[PDB]
């Protein structure tokens, strides 16, 4: 829309976005990952 002249952000290079804007060479190589929720249980000597 002309509001911004550059997007300096973690913008993922995609086929969808590449049809409209010019991505640079990646400054960070990465991928998609799944984040999930994370000692000793010796009750006693018996």
């Amino acid at each position: 829309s002309g509001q911004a002249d550059m997007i300096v952000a973690p913008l993922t290079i995609n086929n969808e976005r590449a049809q409209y804007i010019e991505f640079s060479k990646p400054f960070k190589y990465q991928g998609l990952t799944i984040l999930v929720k994370k000692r000793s249980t010796l009750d006693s000597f018996m």
Partner: protein, 49 residues
């Protein structure tokens, strides 16, 4: 395991008179170790694990 291994880029418009020199200044900063400086100071902290 990692999937959809697409990186992060700088977005500019189709014309983008800066498109070529931005990419050349990003490959240069990988080789110079500048991006390893940024990874050290912003990404590699390792508080607890």
């Amino acid at each position: 395991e990692l999937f959809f291994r697409s990186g992060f880029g700088i977005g500019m418009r189709k014309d983008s008179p800066w498109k070529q020199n931005v990419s050349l200044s990003i490959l240069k900063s990988h080789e110079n170790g500048f991006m390893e400086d940024l990874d050290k100071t912003w990404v590699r902290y390792q508080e607890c694990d």
